[PDB]
C-alpha cells in the first residue's frame, strides 16, 4: 500500500497474509480475506504459481512475533473456472482457499462481512485498502499492516479513456487514482473494505495496478467486485 498509515492491529481482523514456502522460511506474497473459519477469499493470480501456501491469521507485523497469529496450511485451492492467467483485464480474479484447520475467532481474527449480491457503490464511496504490499512503486513490502483511504471511482468514470478504458469491467471495482495512495505489489488478493450503512464490508479483492506504477493518477487500483461472485462463493463453499 503506497501512501498508507499503519493500521491499529484490531481494525481489520478478516485480513490474512498468504505466504509461500521459500527455503527454510515463509514469504508473504498476497493478502486474502477470512470468510469462513476454514475458508479464505483471495485473488486467483496469487495462486497461479505451483507453490506451497500457508495462511496467517491474526497477523500484524510480518517480521516479528505479535503473539496473536495462527498459522494454517492450504488444503484446497478453488480458482474461478473462468480465470485466465494471460488476461487479468478479463476478470474472474478470485479464488477460494479451504484451510487444513478451522481457525479460532477473537479480536484479531474475524470473518469478513461480504456485500449482498449485485451491490454497486455510488461513485466516491469511502473505502480502505489494507495490506503488506510495496510501500512504493518498485519498493519493498511493509512490515506492519497498512491502510489507505481510496474512494471508489464508478464504472462509467473508471472505464473512460482517460482512466482504464476497456480494461475495466463491471465485475470490478475501481478505487483511488489520486496519484499518492494505492494498492501495490503484494496487496493483491486482500480486501477493499467499504463503509455501507454503518458497517465495513469487503467489496473488493485487490487485483491490479497500472504497469506504469502503483500510485498513478487516473489509474485507480482495480479490484474484483465481490458482490458479483456471491453465488459462486456460496456454491464452492457448499460443494466443498
Ligand atoms: C497485486 O499485488 C497487484 C498490485 C495490486 C499486482 C499483481 N499481483 S502480485 O504482485 O501478487 C503478482 C504478479 C505477478 C506474479 C508472477 C506474482 C505476483 C500487479 O502488479 O498488478
Ligand atoms: Ca507477526
**SS (HEC) of 16-58:** EEEEEEECCEEEEEEEEEEEECCEEEECHHHHCCCCCEEEEEC
Domain ranges of the chain: 1-12+112-227, 13-111+228-240
**Cell digits of residue 155:** 464504472
Cα dihedral across residues 26, 31, 37, 39: positive or negative: negative
Mutate to test the pocket of ligand 1, among 32, 43, 45 (most ligand atoms within 8 A of CB): 45
Q: Report how far Cα 58 is from the mean position of its chain's Cα atoms.
A: 16
* Beta-strand runs (E) in the chain: 5-6, 15-22, 25-36, 39-42, 53-57, 70-79, 95-99, 127-131, 146-149, 152-153, 172-175, 191-196, 199-208, 221-225
Ligand 1, from 185, 207, 219: best to mutate by most atoms within 8 Å of Cβ? 185
User: What ligand is nearest to the CA atom of residue 28?
Assistant: 1
- Length of the chain, please? 240
106 Cα–ligand 1 center, Å? 30
Q: Can 1-12+112-227 and 13-111+228-240 be said to share one CATH topology?
A: yes
Distance 83 CA to ligand 2 centre (A): 32
DSSP 111: P
Contacts of 25 (CB under 8 A, 6+ apart): none
Spatial distance between the Cα atoms of 39 and 99, rounded to a whole number of angstroms: 6
Asked if 116 and 196 count as a contact pair (C-beta separation under 8 A), the reply is: no
CA distance linking residue 136 with residue 138, whole number of Å:
6
Resolution in Å equals 1.9
Instruction: Write down the experimental method used for this entry.
Output: X-ray
Q: Is 10 annotated as a binding residue?
A: no
Q: Which residues pair with 56 in a beta bridge?
A: 17, 71
CATH architecture of the region 13-111+228-240: Beta Barrel (2.40)
Segment holding 234, helix H or strand E: helix 230-239
- 125 Cβ contact list (under 8 Å, min separation 6): 151, 152, 194, 195, 196
Task: Report the alpha-carbon distance of residue 66 to residue 15 in Å, rounded.
Answer: 15
- Grid cell for residue 231: 453465488
- C-alpha 220/C-alpha 209 separation (Å) is 7
Q: Which residues have C-beta within 8 Å of that of residue 72, sequence separation ≥ 6?
A: 54, 55, 57, 99, 100, 101, 103
The DSSP bridge partners found for residue 144 are: 61
Which H or E element spans position 231? helix 230-239
Ligand 1 centre distance from Cα of residue 79 (Å)? 16
CATH 3.30.930.10 for domain 1-12+112-227, yes or no, is: no
Ligand 1 neighbours by CB, cut-off 6 Å: 29-30, 45-46, 133, 183-188, 206, 208-209, 221
| 146-149, strands of its sheet edge to edge | 5-6, 146-149, 127-131, 191-196, 199-208, 221-225, 172-175, 152-153
Q: Is 77 helix (H, G, I), strand (E, B) or coil?
A: strand
Amino acid at each position: 500500500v503506497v501512501g498508507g498509515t499503519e493500521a491499529q492491529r484490531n481494525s481489520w481482523p478478516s485480513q490474512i497474509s498468504l505466504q509461500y514456502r521459500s527455503g527454510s522460511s515463509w514469504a508473504h506474497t498476497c493478502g486474502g480475506t477470512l470468510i469462513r473459519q476454514n475458508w479464505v477469499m483471495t485473488a486467483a493470480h496469487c495462486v497461479d504459481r505451483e507453490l506451497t501456501f500457508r495462511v496467517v491469521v491474526g497477523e500484524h507485523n510480518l517480521n516479528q512475533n505479535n503473539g496473536t497469529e495462527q498459522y494454517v496450511g492450504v488444503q484446497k485451492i478453488v480458482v474461478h473456472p473462468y480465470w485466465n492467467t494471460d488476461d487479468v483485464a478479463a476478470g474472474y480474479d478470485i479464488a477460494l482457499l479451504r484451510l487444513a484447520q478451522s481457525v479460532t475467532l477473537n479480536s484479531y481474527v474475524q470473518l469478513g462481512v461480504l456485500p449482498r449480491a449485485g451491490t454497486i457503490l455510488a461513485n466516491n464511496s469511502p473505502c480502505y485498502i489494507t495490506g503488506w504490499g510495496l510501500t512504493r512503486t518498485n519498493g519493498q513490502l511493509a512490515q506492519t499492516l497498512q491502510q489507505a483511504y481510496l474512494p471508489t471511482v464508478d464504472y462509467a468514470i473508471c472505464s473512460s479513456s482517460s482512466y482504464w478504458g476497456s480494461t475495466v469491467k463491471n465485475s470490478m471495482v475501481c478505487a483511488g487514482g489520486d496519484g499518492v495512495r494505492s494498492g501495490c505489489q503484494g496487496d493483491s488478493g486482500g480486501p477493499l473494505h467499504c463503509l455501507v450503512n454503518g458497517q465495513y464490508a469487503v467489496h473488493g479483492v485487490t487485483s491490479f495496478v497500472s504497469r506504469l506504477g502503483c500510485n498513478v493518477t487516473r489509474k485507480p487500483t482495480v479490484f474484483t467486485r465481490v458482490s458479483a461472485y456471491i453465488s459462486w462463493i456460496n456454491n464452492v463453499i457448499a460443494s466443498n
